[PDB]
Short mmCIF file of C-alpha atoms and ligand atoms in Angstrom, two decimals:
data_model
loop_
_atom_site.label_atom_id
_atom_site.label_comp_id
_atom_site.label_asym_id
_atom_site.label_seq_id
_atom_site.Cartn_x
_atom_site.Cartn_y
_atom_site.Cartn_z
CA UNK A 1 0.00 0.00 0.00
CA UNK A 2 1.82 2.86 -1.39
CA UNK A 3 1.43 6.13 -2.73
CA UNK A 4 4.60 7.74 -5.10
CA UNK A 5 4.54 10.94 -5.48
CA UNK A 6 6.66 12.31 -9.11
CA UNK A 7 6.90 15.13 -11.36
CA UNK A 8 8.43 17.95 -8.60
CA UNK A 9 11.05 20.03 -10.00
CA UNK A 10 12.44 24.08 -10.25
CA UNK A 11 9.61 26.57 -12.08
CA UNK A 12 10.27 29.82 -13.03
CA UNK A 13 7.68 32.31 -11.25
CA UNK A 14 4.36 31.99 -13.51
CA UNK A 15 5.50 29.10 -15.20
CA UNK A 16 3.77 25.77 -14.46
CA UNK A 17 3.66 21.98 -13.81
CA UNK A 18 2.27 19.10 -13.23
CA UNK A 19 2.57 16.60 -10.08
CA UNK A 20 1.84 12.47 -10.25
CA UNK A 21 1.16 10.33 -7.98
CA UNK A 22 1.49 7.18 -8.05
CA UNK A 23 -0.50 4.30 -6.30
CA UNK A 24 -1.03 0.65 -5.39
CA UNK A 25 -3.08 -0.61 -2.53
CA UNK A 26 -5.77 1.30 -2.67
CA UNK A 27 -7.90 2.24 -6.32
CA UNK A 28 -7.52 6.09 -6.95
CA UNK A 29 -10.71 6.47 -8.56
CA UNK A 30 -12.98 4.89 -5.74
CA UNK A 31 -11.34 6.75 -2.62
CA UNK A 32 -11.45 10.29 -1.58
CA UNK A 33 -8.06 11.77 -2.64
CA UNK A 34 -5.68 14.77 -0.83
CA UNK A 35 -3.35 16.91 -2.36
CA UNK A 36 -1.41 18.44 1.14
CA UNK A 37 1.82 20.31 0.60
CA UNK A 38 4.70 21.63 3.63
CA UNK A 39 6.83 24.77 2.86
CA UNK A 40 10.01 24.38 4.01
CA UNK A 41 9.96 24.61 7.95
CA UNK A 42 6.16 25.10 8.30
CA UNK A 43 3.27 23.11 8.78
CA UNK A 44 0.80 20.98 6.54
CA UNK A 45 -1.61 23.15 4.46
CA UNK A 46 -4.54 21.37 2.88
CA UNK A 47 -4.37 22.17 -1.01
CA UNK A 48 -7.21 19.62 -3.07
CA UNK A 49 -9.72 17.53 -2.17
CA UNK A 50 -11.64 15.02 -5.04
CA UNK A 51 -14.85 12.73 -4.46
CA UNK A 52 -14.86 9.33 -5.97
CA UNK A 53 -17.80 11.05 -7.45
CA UNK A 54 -15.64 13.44 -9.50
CA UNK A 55 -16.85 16.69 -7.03
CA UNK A 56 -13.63 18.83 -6.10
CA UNK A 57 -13.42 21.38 -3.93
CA UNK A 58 -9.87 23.70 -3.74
CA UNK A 59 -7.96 26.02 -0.81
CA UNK A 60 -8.17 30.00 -1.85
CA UNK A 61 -4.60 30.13 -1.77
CA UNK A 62 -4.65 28.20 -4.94
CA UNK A 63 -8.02 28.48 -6.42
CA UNK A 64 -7.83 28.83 -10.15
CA UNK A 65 -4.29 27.83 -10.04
CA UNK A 66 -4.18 24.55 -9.44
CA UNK A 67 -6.21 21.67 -11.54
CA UNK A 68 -6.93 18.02 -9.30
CA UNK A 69 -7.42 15.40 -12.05
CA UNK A 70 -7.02 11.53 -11.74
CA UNK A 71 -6.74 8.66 -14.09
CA UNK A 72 -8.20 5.11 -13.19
CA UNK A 73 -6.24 2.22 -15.37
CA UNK A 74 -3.40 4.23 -14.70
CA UNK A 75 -4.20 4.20 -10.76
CA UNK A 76 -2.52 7.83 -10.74
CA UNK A 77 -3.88 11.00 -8.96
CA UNK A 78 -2.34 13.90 -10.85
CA UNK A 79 -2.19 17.95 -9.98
CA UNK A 80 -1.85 20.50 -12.30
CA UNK A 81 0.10 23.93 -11.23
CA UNK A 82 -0.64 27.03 -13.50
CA UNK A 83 0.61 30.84 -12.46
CA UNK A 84 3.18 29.48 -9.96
CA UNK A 85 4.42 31.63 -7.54
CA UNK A 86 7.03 31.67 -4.65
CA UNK A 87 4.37 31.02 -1.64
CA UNK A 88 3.80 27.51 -3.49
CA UNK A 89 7.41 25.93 -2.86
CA UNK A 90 7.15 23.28 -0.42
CA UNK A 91 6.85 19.35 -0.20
CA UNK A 92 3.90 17.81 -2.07
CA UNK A 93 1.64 14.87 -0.53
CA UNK A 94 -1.20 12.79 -1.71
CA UNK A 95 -2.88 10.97 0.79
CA UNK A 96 -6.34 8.91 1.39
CA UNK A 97 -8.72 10.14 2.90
CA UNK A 98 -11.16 8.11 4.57
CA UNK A 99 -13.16 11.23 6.41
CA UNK A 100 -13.76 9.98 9.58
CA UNK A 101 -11.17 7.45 9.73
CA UNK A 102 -8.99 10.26 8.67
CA UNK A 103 -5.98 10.09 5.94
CA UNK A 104 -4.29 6.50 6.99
CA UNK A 105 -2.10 6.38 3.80
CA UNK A 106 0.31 8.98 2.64
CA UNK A 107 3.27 9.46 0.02
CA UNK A 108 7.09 11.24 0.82
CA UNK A 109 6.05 13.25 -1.75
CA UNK A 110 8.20 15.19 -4.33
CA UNK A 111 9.99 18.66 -3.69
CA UNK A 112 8.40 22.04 -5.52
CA UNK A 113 10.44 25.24 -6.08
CA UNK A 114 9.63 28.36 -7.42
CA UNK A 115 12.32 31.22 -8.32
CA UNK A 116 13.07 33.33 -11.11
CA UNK A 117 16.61 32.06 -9.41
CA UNK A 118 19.59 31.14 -11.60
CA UNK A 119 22.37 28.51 -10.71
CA UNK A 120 25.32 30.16 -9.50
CA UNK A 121 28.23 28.64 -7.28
CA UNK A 122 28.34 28.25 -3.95
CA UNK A 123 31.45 30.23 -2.72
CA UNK A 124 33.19 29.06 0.22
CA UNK A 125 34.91 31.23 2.66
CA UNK A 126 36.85 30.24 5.80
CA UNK A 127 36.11 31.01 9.18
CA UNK A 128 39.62 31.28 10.79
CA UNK A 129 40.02 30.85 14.40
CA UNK A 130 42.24 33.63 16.60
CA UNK A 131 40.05 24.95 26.84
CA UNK A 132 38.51 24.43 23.32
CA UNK A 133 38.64 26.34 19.68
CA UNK A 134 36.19 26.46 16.82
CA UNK A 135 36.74 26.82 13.02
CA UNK A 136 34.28 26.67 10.05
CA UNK A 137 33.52 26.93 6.64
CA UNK A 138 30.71 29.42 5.64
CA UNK A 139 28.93 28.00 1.85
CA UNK A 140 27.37 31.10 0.68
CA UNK A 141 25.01 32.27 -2.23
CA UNK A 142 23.67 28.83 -4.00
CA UNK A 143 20.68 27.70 -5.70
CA UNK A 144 18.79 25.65 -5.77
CA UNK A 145 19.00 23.28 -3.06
CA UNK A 146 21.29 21.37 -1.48
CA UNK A 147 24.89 21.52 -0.36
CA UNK A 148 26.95 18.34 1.35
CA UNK A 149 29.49 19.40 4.13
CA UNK A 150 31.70 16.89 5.30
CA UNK A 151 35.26 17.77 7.30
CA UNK A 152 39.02 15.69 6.73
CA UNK A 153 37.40 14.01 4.11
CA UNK A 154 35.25 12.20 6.54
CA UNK A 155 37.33 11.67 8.95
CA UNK A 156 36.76 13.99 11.50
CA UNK A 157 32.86 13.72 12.49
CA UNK A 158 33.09 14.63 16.00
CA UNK A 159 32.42 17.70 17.03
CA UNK A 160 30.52 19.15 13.59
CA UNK A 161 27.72 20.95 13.35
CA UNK A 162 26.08 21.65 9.62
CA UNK A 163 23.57 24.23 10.19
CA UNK A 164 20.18 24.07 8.00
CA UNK A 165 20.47 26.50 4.80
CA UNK A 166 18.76 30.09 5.41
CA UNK A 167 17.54 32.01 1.88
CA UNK A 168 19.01 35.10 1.32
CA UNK A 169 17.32 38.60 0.23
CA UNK A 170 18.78 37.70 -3.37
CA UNK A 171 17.26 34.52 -3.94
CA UNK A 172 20.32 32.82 -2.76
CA UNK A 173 20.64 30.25 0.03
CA UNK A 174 23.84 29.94 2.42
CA UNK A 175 24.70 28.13 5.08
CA UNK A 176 27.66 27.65 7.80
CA UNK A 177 29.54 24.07 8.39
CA UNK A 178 31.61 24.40 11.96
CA UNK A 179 33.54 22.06 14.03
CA UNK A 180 34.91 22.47 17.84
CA UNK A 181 38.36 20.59 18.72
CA UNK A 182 40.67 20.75 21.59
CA UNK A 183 42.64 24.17 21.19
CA UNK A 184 46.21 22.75 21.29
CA UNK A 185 45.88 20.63 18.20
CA UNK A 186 45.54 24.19 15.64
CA UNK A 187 49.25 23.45 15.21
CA UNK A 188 49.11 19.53 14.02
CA UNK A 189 46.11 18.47 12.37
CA UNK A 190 45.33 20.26 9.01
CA UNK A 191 41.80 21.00 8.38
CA UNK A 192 39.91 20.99 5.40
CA UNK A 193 35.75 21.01 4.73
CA UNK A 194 34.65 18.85 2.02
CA UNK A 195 32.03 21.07 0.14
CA UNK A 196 29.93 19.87 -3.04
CA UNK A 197 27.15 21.42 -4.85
CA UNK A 198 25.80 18.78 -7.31
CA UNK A 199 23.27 20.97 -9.61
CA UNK A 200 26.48 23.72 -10.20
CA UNK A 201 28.92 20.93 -10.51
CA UNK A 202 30.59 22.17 -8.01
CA UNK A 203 32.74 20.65 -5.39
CA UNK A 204 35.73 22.33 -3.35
CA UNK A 205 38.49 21.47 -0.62
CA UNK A 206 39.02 24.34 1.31
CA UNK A 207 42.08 24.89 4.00
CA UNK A 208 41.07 26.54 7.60
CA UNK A 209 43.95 27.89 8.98
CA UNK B 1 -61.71 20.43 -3.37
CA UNK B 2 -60.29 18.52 -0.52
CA UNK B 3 -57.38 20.68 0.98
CA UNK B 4 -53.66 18.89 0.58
CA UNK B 5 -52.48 16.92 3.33
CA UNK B 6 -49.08 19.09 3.50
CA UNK B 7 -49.69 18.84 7.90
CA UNK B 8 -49.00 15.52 7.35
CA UNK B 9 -45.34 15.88 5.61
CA UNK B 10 -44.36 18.99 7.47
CA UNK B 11 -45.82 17.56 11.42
CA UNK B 12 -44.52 14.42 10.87
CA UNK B 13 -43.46 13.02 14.34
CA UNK B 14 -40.35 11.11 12.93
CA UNK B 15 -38.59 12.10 9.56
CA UNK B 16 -36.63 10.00 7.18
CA UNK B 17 -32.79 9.05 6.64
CA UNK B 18 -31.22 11.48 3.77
CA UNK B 19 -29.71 8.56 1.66
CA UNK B 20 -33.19 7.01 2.01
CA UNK B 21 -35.62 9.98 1.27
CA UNK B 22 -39.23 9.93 1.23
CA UNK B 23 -41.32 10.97 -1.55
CA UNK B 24 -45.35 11.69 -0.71
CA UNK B 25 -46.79 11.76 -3.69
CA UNK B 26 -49.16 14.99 -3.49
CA UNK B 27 -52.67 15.18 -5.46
CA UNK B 28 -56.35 15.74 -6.30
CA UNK B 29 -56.16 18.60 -3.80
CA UNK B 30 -55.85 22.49 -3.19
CA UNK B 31 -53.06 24.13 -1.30
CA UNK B 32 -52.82 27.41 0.27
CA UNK B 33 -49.08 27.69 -0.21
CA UNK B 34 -49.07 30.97 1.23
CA UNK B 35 -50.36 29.42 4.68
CA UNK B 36 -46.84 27.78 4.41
CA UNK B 37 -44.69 30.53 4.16
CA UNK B 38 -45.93 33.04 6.38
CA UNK B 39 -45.51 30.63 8.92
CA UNK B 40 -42.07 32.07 9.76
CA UNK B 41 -40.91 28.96 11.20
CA UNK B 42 -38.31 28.11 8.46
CA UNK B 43 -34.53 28.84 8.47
CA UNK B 44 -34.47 28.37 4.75
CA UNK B 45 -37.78 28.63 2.60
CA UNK B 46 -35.82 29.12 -0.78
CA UNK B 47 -37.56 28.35 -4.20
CA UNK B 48 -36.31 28.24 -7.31
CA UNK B 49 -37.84 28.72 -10.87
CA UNK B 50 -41.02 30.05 -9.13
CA UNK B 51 -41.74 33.03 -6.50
CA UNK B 52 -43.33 32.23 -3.56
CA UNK B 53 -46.24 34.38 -2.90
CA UNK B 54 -47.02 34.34 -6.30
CA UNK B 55 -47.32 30.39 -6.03
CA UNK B 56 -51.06 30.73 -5.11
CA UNK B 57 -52.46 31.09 -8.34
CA UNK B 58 -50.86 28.27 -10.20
CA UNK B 59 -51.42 24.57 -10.84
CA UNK B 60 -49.50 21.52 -11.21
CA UNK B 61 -50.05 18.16 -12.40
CA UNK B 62 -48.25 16.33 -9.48
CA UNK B 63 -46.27 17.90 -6.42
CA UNK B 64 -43.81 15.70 -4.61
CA UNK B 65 -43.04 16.34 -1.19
CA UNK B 66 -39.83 14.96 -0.53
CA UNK B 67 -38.12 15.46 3.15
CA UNK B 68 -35.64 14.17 5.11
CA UNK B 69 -33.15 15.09 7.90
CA UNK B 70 -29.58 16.81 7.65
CA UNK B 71 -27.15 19.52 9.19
CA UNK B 72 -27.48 22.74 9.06
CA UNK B 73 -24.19 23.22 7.00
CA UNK B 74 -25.25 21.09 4.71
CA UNK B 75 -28.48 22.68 4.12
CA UNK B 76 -26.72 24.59 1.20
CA UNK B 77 -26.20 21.69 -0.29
CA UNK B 78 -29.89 20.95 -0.79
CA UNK B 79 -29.91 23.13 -4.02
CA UNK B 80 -29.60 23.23 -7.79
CA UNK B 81 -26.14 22.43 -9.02
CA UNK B 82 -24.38 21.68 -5.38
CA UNK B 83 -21.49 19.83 -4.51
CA UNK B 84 -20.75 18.03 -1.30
CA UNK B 85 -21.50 14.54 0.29
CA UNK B 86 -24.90 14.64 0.73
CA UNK B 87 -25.55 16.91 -2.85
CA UNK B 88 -23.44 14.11 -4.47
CA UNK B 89 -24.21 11.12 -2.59
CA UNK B 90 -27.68 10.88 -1.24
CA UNK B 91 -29.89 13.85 -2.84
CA UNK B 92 -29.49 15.26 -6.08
CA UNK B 93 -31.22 18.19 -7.48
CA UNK B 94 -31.55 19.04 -11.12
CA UNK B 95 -29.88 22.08 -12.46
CA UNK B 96 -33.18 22.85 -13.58
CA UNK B 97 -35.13 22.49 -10.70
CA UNK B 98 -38.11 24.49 -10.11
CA UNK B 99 -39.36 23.78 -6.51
CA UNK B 100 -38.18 24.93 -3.34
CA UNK B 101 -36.90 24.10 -0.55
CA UNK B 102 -37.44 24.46 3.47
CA UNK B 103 -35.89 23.69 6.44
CA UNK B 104 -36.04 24.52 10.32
CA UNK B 105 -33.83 23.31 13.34
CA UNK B 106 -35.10 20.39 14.92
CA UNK B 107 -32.42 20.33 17.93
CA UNK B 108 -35.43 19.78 20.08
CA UNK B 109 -37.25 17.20 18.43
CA UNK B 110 -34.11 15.27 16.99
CA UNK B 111 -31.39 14.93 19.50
CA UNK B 112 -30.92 12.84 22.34
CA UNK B 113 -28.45 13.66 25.46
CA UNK B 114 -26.50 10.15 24.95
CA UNK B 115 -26.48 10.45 21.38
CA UNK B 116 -29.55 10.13 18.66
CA UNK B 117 -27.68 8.02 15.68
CA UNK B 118 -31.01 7.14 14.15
CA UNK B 119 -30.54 9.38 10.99
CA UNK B 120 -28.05 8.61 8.71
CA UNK B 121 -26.15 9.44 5.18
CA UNK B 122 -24.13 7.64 2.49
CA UNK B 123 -20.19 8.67 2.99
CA UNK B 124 -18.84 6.23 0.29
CA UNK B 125 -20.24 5.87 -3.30
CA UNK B 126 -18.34 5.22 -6.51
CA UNK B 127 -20.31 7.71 -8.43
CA UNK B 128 -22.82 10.48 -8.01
CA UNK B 129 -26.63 10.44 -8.12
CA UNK B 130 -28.73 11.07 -10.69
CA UNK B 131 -31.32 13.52 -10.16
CA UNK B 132 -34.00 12.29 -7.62
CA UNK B 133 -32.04 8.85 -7.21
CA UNK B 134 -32.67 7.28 -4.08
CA UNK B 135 -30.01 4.64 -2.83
CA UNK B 136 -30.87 2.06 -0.21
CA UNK B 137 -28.10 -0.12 -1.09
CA UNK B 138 -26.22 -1.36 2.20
CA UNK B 139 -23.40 -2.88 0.20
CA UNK B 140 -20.02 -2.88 1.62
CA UNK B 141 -17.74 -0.60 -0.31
CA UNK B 142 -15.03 -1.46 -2.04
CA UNK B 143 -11.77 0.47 -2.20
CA UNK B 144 -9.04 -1.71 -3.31
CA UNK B 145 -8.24 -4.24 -6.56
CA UNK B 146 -8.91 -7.08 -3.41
CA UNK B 147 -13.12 -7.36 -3.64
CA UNK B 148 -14.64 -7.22 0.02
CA UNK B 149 -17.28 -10.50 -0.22
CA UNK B 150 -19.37 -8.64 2.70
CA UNK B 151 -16.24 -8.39 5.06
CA UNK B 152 -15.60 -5.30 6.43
CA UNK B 153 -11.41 -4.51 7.14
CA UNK B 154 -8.90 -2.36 5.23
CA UNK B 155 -10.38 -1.05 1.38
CA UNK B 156 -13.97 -2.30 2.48
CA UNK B 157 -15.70 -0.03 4.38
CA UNK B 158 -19.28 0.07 5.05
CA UNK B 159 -21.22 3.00 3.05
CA UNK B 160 -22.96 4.37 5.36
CA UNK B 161 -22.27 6.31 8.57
CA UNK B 162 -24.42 8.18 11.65
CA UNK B 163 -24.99 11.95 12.04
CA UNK B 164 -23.52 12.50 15.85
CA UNK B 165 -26.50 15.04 16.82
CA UNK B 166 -26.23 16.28 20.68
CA UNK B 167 -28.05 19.13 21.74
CA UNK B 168 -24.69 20.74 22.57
CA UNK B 169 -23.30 20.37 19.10
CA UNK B 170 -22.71 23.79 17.32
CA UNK B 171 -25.57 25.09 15.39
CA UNK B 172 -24.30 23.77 11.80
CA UNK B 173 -23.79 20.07 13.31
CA UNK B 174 -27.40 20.49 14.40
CA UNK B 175 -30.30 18.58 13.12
CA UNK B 176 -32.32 20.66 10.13
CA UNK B 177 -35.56 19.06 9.16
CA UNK B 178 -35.88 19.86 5.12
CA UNK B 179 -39.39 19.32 2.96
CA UNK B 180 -38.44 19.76 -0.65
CA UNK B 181 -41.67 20.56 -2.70
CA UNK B 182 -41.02 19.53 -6.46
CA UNK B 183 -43.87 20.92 -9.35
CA UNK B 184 -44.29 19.66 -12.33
CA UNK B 185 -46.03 20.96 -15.38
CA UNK B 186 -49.37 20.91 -17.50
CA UNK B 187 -49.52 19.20 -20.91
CA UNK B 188 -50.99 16.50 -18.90
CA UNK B 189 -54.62 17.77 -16.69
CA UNK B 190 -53.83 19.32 -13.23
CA UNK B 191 -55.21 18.66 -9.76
CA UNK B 192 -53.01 20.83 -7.58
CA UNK B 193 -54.23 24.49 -7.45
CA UNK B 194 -54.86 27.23 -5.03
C1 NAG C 301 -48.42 21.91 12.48
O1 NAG C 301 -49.15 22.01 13.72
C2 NAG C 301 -49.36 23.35 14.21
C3 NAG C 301 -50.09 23.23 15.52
O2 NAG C 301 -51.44 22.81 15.34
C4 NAG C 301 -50.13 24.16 13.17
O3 NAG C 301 -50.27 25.50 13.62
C5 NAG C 301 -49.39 24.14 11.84
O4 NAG C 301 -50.14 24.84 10.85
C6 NAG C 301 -49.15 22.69 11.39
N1 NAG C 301 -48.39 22.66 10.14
C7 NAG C 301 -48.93 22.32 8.96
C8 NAG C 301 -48.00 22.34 7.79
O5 NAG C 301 -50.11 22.01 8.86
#
């Protein structure tokens, strides 16, 4: 009993596009069927609701925006994004509902953004230190989504702290990769963050010193 | 010249299940229509196709009462061109209807302190009704490839569930009583008049 969510991506502002879900376990067509999306970091907004009699009923945040359509030998709920804006990046979910009995099966989902945002690079600086020390790597001014921060290659996991990216006035995400160690050992070890940035094809190996 | 025995739909001690609707089958009499609506005892008295005071001097062939027992909220629903479980699932109106309708709270008559689950609706159906379809079908429904073979459990679900009504629910989740008055046409002789 699945559902398998498909077709998230990057949209331009006003562009549009359409979301799949996938399903086996329960018949689309005979079950009442959710549309529920999550911005990053907030809660669950309810987005489109479907009958198995074909009635559909729509949030005003996306009313005439956003089409709910389904598909029954294909056993796929679908949802169709015109106009999109920036308020509408978030996680997508289909789900059953069963009313009363609530929604007892839901999908991961797929991953909406919406930016007029190009690609960039994420450029990373070092944050240089001066009982216990603490030196960092600061990944600044990427997009889209995401960035992988390891430290030594690996090696050194103790100790690190990858903070969640924050989205800058530009469009442009950033984020800080730290690590504390004893203060003696600035001398011996060399230290190097690991940074890579699949969608730029971008990876670098920078020296904290 | 016998006068229309519309006391006997409207003061009816116990009312019907909205999935299973009644239909009195009005005529061969006169009705003062007007005595209805002035009665003022109606939270929703809305016609359509047809003005109500006006609805004196007119004649139909047959008038079907039809009434049954719902929420408040979902007295919207009993209109022309409605979505909405009971709109889609247990009474239909045509987008050309040319009736009306009427309802009133029946909080008092219609809800018990432990719990009155005597009036029902249809929450699963694989399609919606057609116009003045009534569905007494108790057949457990199916919502997976897996066929159910009248066992409830997981994708087979019985149809139909209970209106909760207390007499501390919220005014929408109270019990509306609703008398749907359907006319008809000539062509054919009339016996309903004013
Ligand atoms: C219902 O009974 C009351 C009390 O006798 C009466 O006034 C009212 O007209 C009756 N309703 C109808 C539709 O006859």
């Amino acid at each position: 009993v699945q559902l398998v969510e498909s077709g998230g991506g990057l949209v331009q502002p006003g562009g549009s596009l359409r979301l799949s879900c996938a399903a086996s376990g329960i018949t689309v067509s005979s079950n009442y069927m959710n549309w529920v999306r999550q911005a990053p970091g907030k809660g669950l907004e309810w987005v489109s609701l479907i009958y198995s009699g074909g009635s559909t009923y729509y949030a005003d945040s996306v009313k005439g925006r956003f089409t709910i359509s389904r598909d029954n030998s294909k056993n796929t709920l679908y949802l169709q994004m015109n106009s999109l804006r920036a308020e509408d990046t978030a996680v997508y979910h289909c789900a059953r509902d069963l009313v009363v009995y609530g929604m007892d099966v839901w999908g991961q989902g797929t991953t909406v953004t919406v930016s007029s945002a190009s690609t960039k690079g994420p450029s990373v600086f070092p944050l240089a230190p001066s009982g216990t020390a603490a030196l960092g790597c600061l990944v600044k001014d990427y997009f889209p989504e995401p960035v992988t921060v390891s430290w030594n290659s690996g090696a050194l996991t103790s100790g690190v702290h990858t903070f969640p990216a924050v989205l800058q006035s530009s469009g442009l995400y950033s984020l800080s990769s730290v690590v504390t160690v004893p203060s003696s050992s600035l001398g011996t070890q060399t230290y190097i963050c690991n940074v890579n940035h699949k969608p730029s094809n971008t990876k670098v190996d920078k020296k904290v010193e | 010249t016998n006068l229309c025995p519309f006391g006997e739909v409207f003061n009816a001690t116990r009312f019907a299940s909205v999935y299973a609707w009644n239909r009195k089958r009005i005529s061969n009499c006169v009705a003062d229509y007007s005595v209805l609506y002035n009665s003022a005892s109606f939270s929703t008295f809305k016609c359509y196709g047809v003005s109500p005071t006006k609805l004196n001097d007119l004649c139909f062939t047959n008038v079907y009462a039809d009434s049954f027992v719902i929420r408040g909220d979902e007295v919207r629903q009993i209109a022309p061109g409605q979505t909405g479980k009971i709109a889609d699932y247990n009474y239909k109106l045509p987008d050309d209807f040319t009736g009306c309708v009427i309802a009133w709270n029946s909080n008092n008559l219609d809800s018990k302190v432990g719990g009155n689950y005597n009036y029902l609706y249809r929450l699963f159906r694989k399609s919606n009704l057609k116009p003045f379809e009534r569905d007494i079908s108790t057949e457990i429904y199916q919502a997976g490839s897996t066929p159910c073979n009248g066992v409830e459990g997981f994708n087979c679900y019985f149809p139909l569930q209970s209106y909760g009504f207390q007499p501390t629910n919220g005014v929408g989740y109270q019990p509306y009583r609703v008398v749907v008055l359907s006319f008809e046409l000539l062509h054919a002789p009339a016996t309903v008049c004013g």
